[PDB]
Design an enzyme around this catalytic site. Structure first.
Site, PDB file in Angstrom:
ATOM      1  N   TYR A   1      46.651  48.144  44.925  1.00  0.00           N
ATOM      2  CA  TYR A   1      46.286  46.181  43.802  1.00  0.00           C
ATOM      3  C   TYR A   1      44.948  45.612  44.036  1.00  0.00           C
ATOM      4  O   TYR A   1      43.996  45.543  43.030  1.00  0.00           O
ATOM      5  CB  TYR A   1      46.749  45.505  44.534  1.00  0.00           C
TER       6      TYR A   1
ATOM      7  N   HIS B   1      42.152  32.147  48.543  1.00  0.00           N
ATOM      8  CA  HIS B   1      42.239  33.590  47.734  1.00  0.00           C
ATOM      9  C   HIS B   1      42.895  32.483  45.994  1.00  0.00           C
ATOM     10  O   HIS B   1      41.770  32.557  45.608  1.00  0.00           O
ATOM     11  CB  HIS B   1      44.282  34.386  47.848  1.00  0.00           C
ATOM     12  N   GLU B   2      43.578  31.414  46.081  1.00  0.00           N
ATOM     13  CA  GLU B   2      44.149  30.802  45.200  1.00  0.00           C
ATOM     14  C   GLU B   2      42.414  30.745  44.137  1.00  0.00           C
ATOM     15  O   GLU B   2      42.393  30.248  43.089  1.00  0.00           O
ATOM     16  CB  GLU B   2      44.999  30.303  44.563  1.00  0.00           C
TER      17      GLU B   2
HETATM   18 ZN   LIG Z   1      45.231  36.591  43.364  1.00  0.00          ZN
END
Ligand SMILES: [Zn+2]
EC number: 3.4.24.89
Length: 195
Positions: A153, A117-118
Site C-alpha cells: 500500500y 495522515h489525512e
Molecule cells: Zn491516505
C-alpha cells in the site's frame, strides 16, 4: 515544538478546524488539535489561506450529508472484508474529515496517526501542487517507499507514502527519529520543504 509555537499554531487551527454538532469527547477533540498543532505553521497558514476546513466528526463518516453518497461503497482493496466507507474514520485531499477518537493506528485505519495522515493529503494536494507525484519525490519513493511497512500500500502509492511520512515527521520525536533512520532521503526532503 516549544509551547509558544504550539499555541500560535492552535490559534491558526481555530480558523481551520470545524467541530461537529453531535456529542463527542471534547478533551480528545482538543488532543487532536494539539497534535495537528505540531505541523509547521507555514503549512497551516497555507491551508487557512485556501479556506480548507478540517471537519471533526462525532459519528461515522457516511452519516455526514456531504459524505452520505459514500454509504455502502467498498473502498479500493477492501473487497471481501465486509467493510465499507461507513467504516472509514478519515479522508484527506480536497477536503478533510476525521472521526473523533480514531486517531491511533488500528482504529479502522493503518496510519500512525489519523489526523496528520489525512491533513498531509490536503497539504500535498492543496498547498504543494501534488508534490507526492513530483519527479523528485518519485525517485525518493522508489528507494524508500517500502521502509515504513505496508509494502503493498504505502510502497505502491507515493501519495500514501508521502502522507504517512509526513505524519511520522510531525507526530512526535519518536516517529520523527524513526523516519530519519528508516527514510533518510524522505526526512531530508520534508526538512527542506519546511525551510
Ligand atoms: Zn491516505
Amino acid at each position: 515544538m516549544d509551547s509558544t509555537t504550539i499555541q500560535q499554531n492552535k490559534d491558526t487551527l481555530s480558523q481551520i478546524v470545524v467541530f461537529p454538532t453531535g456529542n463527542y469527547d471534547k478533551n480528545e477533540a482538543n488532543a487532536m488539535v494539539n497534535r495537528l498543532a505540531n505541523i509547521d505553521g507555514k503549512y497551516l497558514n497555507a491551508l487557512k489561506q485556501n479556506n480548507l476546513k478540517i471537519k471533526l466528526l462525532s459519528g461515522k463518516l457516511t452519516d455526514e450529508k456531504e459524505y452520505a453518497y459514500l454509504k455502502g461503497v467498498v473502498p479500493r482493496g477492501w473487497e471481501g472484508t465486509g467493510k465499507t466507507w461507513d467504516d472509514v474514520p478519515g479522508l484527506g485531499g480536497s477536503t478533510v474529515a476525521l472521526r473523533i477518537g480514531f486517531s491511533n493506528k488500528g482504529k479502522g485505519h493503518d496510519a500512525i496517526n489519523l489526523e496528520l495522515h489525512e491533513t498531509a493529503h490536503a497539504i500535498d494536494h492543496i498547498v504543494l501542487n501534488d508534490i507526492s507525484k513530483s519527479a523528485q519525490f518519485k525517485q525518493i519513493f522508489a528507494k524508500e517507499g517500502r521502509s515504513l511497512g505496508n509494502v503493498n500500500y504505502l510502497g505502491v502509492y507515493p501519495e500514501e507514502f508521502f502522507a504517512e511520512s509526513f505524519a511520522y515527521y510531525y507526530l512526535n520525536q519518536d516517529t520523527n527519529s524513526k523516519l530519519k533512520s528508516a527514510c533518510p532521503q524522505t526526512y531530508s526532503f520534508l526538512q527542506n520543504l519546511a525551510k
